[PDB]
Amino acid sequence: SDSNTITSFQVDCYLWHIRKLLSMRDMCDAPFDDRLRRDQKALKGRGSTLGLDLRVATMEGKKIVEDILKSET
Amino acid sequence: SDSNTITSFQVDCYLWHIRKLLSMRDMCDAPFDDRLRRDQKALKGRGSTLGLDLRVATMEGKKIVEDILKSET
């Protein structure tokens, strides 16, 4: 799909990864875990339809987020 | 409320901030902007019932995320 659909998916994948780290550390509440579980299923489906490797998309999302965070300083 | 519930809210605020940076750079697609608008209302309503200042919660979320990212690998 278009460039921005891919970028949006990469960023969403990386932010999911951050949320997962919070949850694994047992630092979130139940609603936060429910959203994590539901978004995981949604991301897997979006990735399938886009043909995208979730692991690589997560790594690309990390670069993009670091990039835009650097630009606001 | 409970500690995990506050922490979840702070993290959600900071991740919304990141997503908003993406949108302000013309880097996201239309569904991503729709989720950003929906989640902004969600953070305002959740924050109001927890009593929390959204700007302070965003700053605290930044600290929490940077901290769990420090000890990743």
Residue numbers in the entry:
A (entry chain B), B (entry chain A): 1 to 73
Paste lines from the article.
Encoded by the smallest of the eight viral genome segments, NS1 is a multifunctional RNA-binding protein, which is considered the main weapon of the virus to antagonize the innate immune response of the host and to ensure viral replication in a hostile anti-viral environment. While the effector domain is to some extent dispensable for the biological activities of NS1, the RBD plays an essential role in several activities that require the interaction of NS1 with viral and non-viral RNAs. This is best illustrated by the total loss of pathogenicity conferred by the alanine substitution of Arg38 and Lys41, the two main residues involved in binding of RNAs by NS1.
The X-ray structure of recombinant wild type H7N1 NS1 RBD (residues 1–73) was solved to 1.93 Å resolution. While it is the first structure that is representative of the RBD of allele B-NS1, its organization is identical to that of the other RBD structures available, forming a symmetric C2 homodimer shaped by three interlocking α-helices from each monomer. Helices α1 (residues S3-M24) and α2 (A30 to L50) are oriented in an antiparallel fashion, whereas helix α3 (L54-K70) sits perpendicular to helix α1. The dimerization interface, with an area of 1189Å2, involves 43% of the monomer residues, which are engaged in 15 H-bonds, including 4 salt bridges (PISA server). Three highly conserved residues of α2 helix (F32, R35, and R46) are involved in the stabilization of the dimer, with R35 being engaged in a salt bridge with D12. Invariant residues R35, R37, R38, and K41, which are involved in RNA binding, adopt different conformations when comparing all the apo RBD homodimers. Nonetheless, the RNA binding interface formed by helices α2 and α2* of the homodimer seems to be well preserved on H7N1. This 3D structure also shows several ligands bound to the RBD, originating from the crystallization buffers. Three 1,2-ethanediol and one partial polyethylene glycol molecules have been assigned in a groove formed by helices α3 and α3*. Interestingly, another partial polyethylene glycol molecule is located in a nonpolar pocket found underneath the RNA binding channel at the RBD molecular two-fold axis (between helices α2 and α2*), making an H-bond with the side chain of R46(A).
